[PDB]
């Protein structure tokens, strides 16, 4: 048979992405598949004046 | 606020390997053209 209704309320949650906030303006993001390729981990800048 | 929203990319950038391409037709005409172009970018806009 049929019975009484039930009062339920589900919250709504806003989900975040890194590329979708303004914080990604300061950074420059690239995709590096494995960080184990970068073993030396040192970068040399050659500045000309 | 001015213009109310900023336009940007949608997925992380990837790296391109475009260092070498010269395996095709080493010849005098393209040689002259390349020298002219890469020297003319200095002055011209």
């Amino acid at each position: 048979k049929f019975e009484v209704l039930l009062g339920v309320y589900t919250n709504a949650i806003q989900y975040v992405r890194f590329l979708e906030t303004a914080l990604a303006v300061s950074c420059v993001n690239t995709e590096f598949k494995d960080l184990s390729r970068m073993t030396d981990g040192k970068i040399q800048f050659r500045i000309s004046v | 606020e001015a213009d109310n929203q900023i336009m940007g990319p949608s997925s992380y950038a990837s790296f391109v390997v475009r260092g070498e391409n010269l395996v095709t037709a080493v010849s005098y005409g393209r040689v002259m053209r390349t020298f002219e172009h890469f020297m003319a970018r200095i002055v011209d806009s």
């Binding site: 420059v28 690239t30 030396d40 040192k42 970068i43 040399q44 050659r46 000309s48 | 950038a13 790296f15 391109v16 390997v17 475009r18 260092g19 070498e20």
Partner: peptide
């Protein structure tokens, strides 16, 4: 830092070969 080798080619970020990229 790996003195004795050859430089083969370059990966690029930002699609511009200028000094601005890494």
């Amino acid at each position: 830092a790996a003195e004795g080798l050859f430089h083969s080619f370059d990966l690029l970020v930002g699609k511009d070969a200028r000094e601005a990229g890494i």
